[PDB]
């Protein structure tokens, strides 16, 4: 059996905003917390549906295990540029979240992309501006002044600082904010405002950050009810050559066994300056061994990998077919990590790691039993009456439609046997996130539209083992 | 006055190897030391005059102000691949050197390029191979093993470690090297010599280093009679995005003024993976503030540089004309650093640093009164009775011909106004290196051909100044 859909994030209708003024909801993430709570995350795309604009990172909570859901809690929404001529592209952007709970600390992390005002990924500059500087062993974000060339950093209490190293006070950027963090990056000269460092057009202040892709994180210590101010984790994980670095949205994992047990894995992907979105999309994970304090980049699956007798690297590649993008991560009972990667083979592409996410084996396994129409997927480990299984959910196709939940037995070394492919949602079907619910039940937050819904409405369903196996 | 042609590094004739079977000599570097000694350095290009093959770093000394010269002392020459099916491209390569002396320590530095077997610069791999890896960092050089993906590292005493971090113990590379350092890189299984980590063709050992460009350093404390084993400085200065990193050959300086007195400046240039040789050649310096122990990279002249309306970076640029390659550096008495860069404008190109070679000013000064036929140049600071004077020497044109010596008056602001341009050599003329001999006398080692000489024969000329004035 399978429950009827419960709509958790309701988008507007026929191009028009909903009751709150919001046209679109988008990128689902679902988390089952130690307290038994269900946390549902999404992009709140106010006016409109594209991969940019006024977008907030929002969650909702359920305590009755998915029956009823509380209020929308906004984690982060950066304030729009009020003097931008095109308001649909006139806001700093947060986009795509990953959720994970550290089982030791009970801390819940939401990691998500950040772009200043622009078209977030489809609006990146073709030239690099340095985003960060290491002054005397400490890393500070850079600022670029109008007309002037040179450093400018952000130190101490948001006190700016000239390329001279002179504490040119008057100037402060806010980073211990305050309201719902919409005032992050606000620039003051005195007690009076001015502008915001994430503003790109028609600026009322002289300072902006570098035009780049960024990676932010916020945490909750009260089961998802209140969230910390965004931590900029970018410099810990982003290399000099990297153009884009963003999350593979959905739900991350904590390793439960082997010598790296307790390691947090967050799926991510990069583009390089050689081919950007045309032929360099490359999956990897970032990880933390200290309960979310510091983060590190693992190697890309495409690093030192052989395609057609020629080795590639994610920093230099230009090959459309060899890309792998958004991914979903799972650990086996034998300690292996499997990375299910969105790609362009029409097939399920899977990478294998032996050292817990850092390095990847030579070959990408392909399963013709599971279609991939170039859309996000979620997969989870689950134990049923002995051993062992993985549950994977994505569009059946052709196109982003006919939602499928696929069931595989985990064999031996460490092989997968696809046992059944059960339809879960007819009509439009895109992004989705699976969770184990306890007691042989499972949950899913997925993208789907009906009856003129804008794109997308995010909906929840429970199901049991019978729905999966017969 | 001007002294007649005095050859130091004699090339061959009409495609014949000279007395010692060395067809070609190339890339002059001239240094006068603390004891008054002159050092002349060259590419010992044994097999041809191309930018690859079997090349040794060699010097010849003079105690008598360049009257007569001592014999050849090989700094470094890596042994050839005896199994390579083409000897002309069948050797690990060293190429281009900078000479410089620390005034306080008297240590003389030779900084030069290195490539494994191949066409060094004209034969670089299309895709990135990681060359180094931090482990409890601790940075080690990577080895790749035929048939396998995965690190392999060179650790203590040259012991090869497996990608897992297990000692192969058996496998070891020669790091403290002995002979002419010709055994550097040799790979052993115990006392069994198998091959060399710098060979890339028809290999006899299982391991090779990354196909990349490297930057090596040797030093002598005995005024140039013996030299240490090559030190690999690459990982201190070469960023991840960099394809090529190599020196602007000739002679370096030490800062004598300002808040950075004692800093050693080595001119270098980089390429990127977007356009490599076709549009990315970018001049910068590397420097040492601790007497040549540790090195750091300065920012490129092309970093955040407004050109043709747009801002570029050395890591992302594709602009042929905006390139700046080999360069020579001088400090002014007001503390400014000037960088004369080989370019493709036909003009002389000059950039200014006000923080001792790290950052560069918005603007590149073009001096039409001075020609540049896209070839290396040489410049030195020199006081004579007044203020302030710089000598710049290069080709006259059209083509690599007519050795010119130009003089400029260093104004206080501090621009420079050119006074006279005097021919020092007729015929075909290319690379050169200038020094200050004292008593208002100057010396120049340069590149020249006559009587069917293989190119080049590298000749010396001593003289002032009435040549410059009158
Ligand atoms: C940060 C961002 O833009 N993420 C978006 C992603 C990305 O643009 C694409 O993977 C580029 O190749 O595309 C999609 C999509 O519905 O297909 C949704 C994400 O919101
Ligand atoms: C590292 C190296 O090869 N240096 C060479 C240099 C280089 O190829 C060029 O600067 C690329 O544009 O070319 C020349 C030259 O004929 O002028 C001489 C140098 O030996
Ligand atoms: Cl602003």
Domains identified in chain A and CATH numbers: 1-130+211-470 (2.120.10.10), 131-210 (2.40.220.10)
How many CB atoms neighbour CB B192 within 10 A?
Answer: 8
Chain B positions touching A352 (Cβ under 8 A) are none
Q: How big is chain B by its Cα radius of gyration, in Å?
A: 22
- Tell whether ligand 1 has an atom less than 6 A from the beta carbon of residue A428: no
Q: Determine the Cα–Cα distance for residues A426 and A391; give it in Å rounded to an integer.
A: 19
Gap from A397 CA to chain B (nearest CA, Å): 35
**Token output for A159:** 């006190």
| The pairing of beta strand B231-232 with beta strand B132-134 | unpaired
Interchain contact, A273 vs B241, CB within 8 Å: yes
Whether A246 is in the pocket of ligand 1, judged by its Cβ within 6 Å, is: yes
Strands A93-101 and A250-251 come out as parallel
Sorted by sequence, the CB contacts under 8 Å of residue A137 that are 6+ apart come out as none
Helix (H, G, I), strand (E, B) or coil at B234: helix
Supply the Cα-derived Rg of chain A in whole angstroms: 22
Residues in chain A with CB shorter than 8 Å from the CB of B315 are: 128, 240-241, 273
Catalytic residue among A43, A51, A186, A428: A51
The closest of A345, A348, A313 to A327, measured between CA atoms, is A348
Partner A contacted by B303 (CB < 8 A): yes
Q: Is the CB of A382 under 6 A from ligand 1?
A: no
In B70-99, the residues whose Cβ lies within 8 Å of chain A are: none
Q: How far is residue A438's CA from residue A198's CA, in Å, rounded to a whole number?
A: 43
B317 touches chain A (CB under 8 A): yes
* Nearest-neighbour CA in chain A from B366: distance (Å): 20
Method: X-ray
CB contact under 8 A, A151 and B359: yes
State both tokens at A459: 């909906």
**A171, A347, A367, B135 from A420: Cα distances, Å:** 61, 16, 13, 44
- A375 alpha carbon, closest ligand: 1
A113 C-beta closer than 6 A to ligand 1: yes
Q: How many CB atoms lie within 10 A of CB A334?
A: 12
Q: Which residues lie near ion ligand 3 (Cβ < 5 Å)?
A: A 195-196, 199, 203-205
Query: Mind telling me the catalytic residues of B?
Result: 51, 326
For this entry, resolution in Å reads 2.5
d(CA A247, CA A143): 25
A51 catalytic per annotation: yes
A79 is in an annotated binding site: no
- How far is the C-alpha of B174 from the C-alpha of B207, rounded, in Å? 13
Q: Which residue from A minimizes the CA distance to B363?
A: A149
* CA distances to A10, A48, B6, B70 from A18, in Å: 8, 11, 88, 88
Residue A202 Rama label (left phi>0; alpha psi -120 to 50; beta) = left
Among candidate residues B332, B320, B250, the one with its CA nearest the CA of residue B285: B250
DSSP label of A13: B
Which contacts qualify for B21-27: CB closer than 8 Å, 24 or more apart? B21/B46, B22/B46, B23/B47, B23/B48, B23/B49, B23/B454, B24/B48, B24/B49, B24/B454, B24/B455, B24/B456, B25/B456, B25/B457, B25/B458, B26/B431, B26/B447, B26/B455, B26/B456, B26/B458, B27/B95, B27/B96, B27/B97, B27/B249, B27/B431
Q: Is B72 a known ligand-binding residue?
A: no
In the Cβ-directed half-sphere of B226, how many Cα atoms lie within 13 Å? 6
- Which residues lie below 8 Å from residue B13, measured CB to CB, with a gap of 6+? B451, B452, B453, B454
A137, A147, A241, best to mutate vs chain B, most B CBs in 10 Å: A241
Query: Cα separation of B459 and B243, whole Å?
Result: 33
Number of A/B CB contacts below 8 angstroms equals: 71
Pairing of strands A378-381, A390-395: antiparallel
Surface-to-core class of residue B23, CB atoms within 10 Å of its CB (0-12 exposed, 13-18 middle, 19+ buried): buried
Q: Are B41 and B110 in contact (CB under 8 A)?
A: yes
Q: Is B127 on the interface with A (CB under 8 A)?
A: yes
Q: Which of A119, A380, A93 is nearest to A254 (CA)?
A: A380
Q: Which ligand is nearest to the CA of A342?
A: 1
Q: Is the CB of B96 under 6 A from ligand 2?
A: yes
Q: Which of A239, A317, A361 sits opposite B240 (nearest CB)?
A: A239
């Amino acid at each position: 059996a399978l429950t009827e859909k419960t709509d958790i994030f309701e988008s507007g209708r026929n191009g028009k905003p909903n009751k709150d003024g919001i046209k679109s909801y988008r990128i689902p993430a679902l988390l089952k917390t130690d307290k038994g709570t269900l946390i549902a995350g999404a992009d709140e795309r106010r006016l409109h549906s594209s991969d940019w604009g006024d977008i907030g990172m929002v969650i909702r909570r359920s305590e009755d295990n998915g029956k009823t859901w509380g209020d929308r809690v906004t984690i982060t929404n950066l304030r729009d540029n009020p003097k931008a001529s095109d308001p649909s592209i006139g806001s700093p952007v947060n986009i795509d979240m990953v959720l994970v709970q550290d089982p030791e600390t009970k801390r819940i992390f939401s990691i998500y992309d950040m772009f200043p005002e622009g078209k977030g990924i489809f609006g990146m500059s073709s030239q690099k501006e340095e985003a960060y500087k290491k002054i005397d062993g400490k890393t500070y974000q850079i600022l670029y002044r109008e007309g002037e060339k040179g450093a400018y950093t952000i130190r101490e209490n948001g006190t700016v600082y000239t390329p001279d190293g002179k504490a040119t006070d008057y100037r402060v950027v806010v980073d211990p904010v305050k309201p719902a963090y919409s005032d992050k990056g606000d620039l003051y000269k005195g007690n009076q405002l001015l502008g915001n460092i994430y503003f790109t057009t028609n600026k009322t202040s002289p300072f902006r950050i570098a035009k780049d892709s960024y990676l932010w994180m916020s945490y909750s210590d009260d089961d998802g009810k209140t969230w910390s101010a965004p931590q900029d984790i970018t410099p810990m994980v982003k290399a000099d050559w990297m153009k884009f670095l963003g999350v593979g949205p959905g739900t991350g994992i904590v390793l439960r066994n082997g010598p790296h047990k307790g390691r947090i894995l967050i799926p991510v992907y990069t583009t390089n300056n050689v081919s950007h979105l045309n032929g360099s999309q490359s999956s990897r994970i970032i990880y933390s061994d200290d309960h979310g304090k510091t983060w590190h980049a693992g190697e890309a699956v495409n690093d030192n990998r052989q395609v057609d007798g020629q080795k590639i690297h994610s920093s230099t590649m230009n090959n459309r077919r060899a890309q792998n993008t958004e991914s979903t991560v799972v650990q086996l009972n034998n300690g292996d990590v499997k990375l299910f990667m969105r790609g362009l083979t029409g097939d399920l592409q899977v990478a294998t790691s032996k050292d817990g996410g850092v390095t990847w084996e030579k070959d990408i396994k392909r399963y013709p039993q599971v279609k991939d129409v170039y859309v996000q997927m979620s997969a989870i480990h689950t134990m049923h009456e002995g051993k062992e299984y993985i549950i994977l959910s994505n569009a059946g196709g052709p196109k982003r439609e006919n939602g499928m939940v696929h069931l595989a037995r985990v064999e031996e070394n460490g092989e997968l046997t696809w046992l059944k492919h059960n339809p879960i949602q007819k009509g439009e079907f895109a992004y989705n996130s699976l969770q184990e619910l306890g007691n042989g039940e499972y949950g899913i937050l997925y993208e789907h539209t009906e009856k003129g819904q804008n794109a997308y409405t995010l909906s929840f369903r429970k199901f049991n083992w019978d729905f999966l196996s017969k």
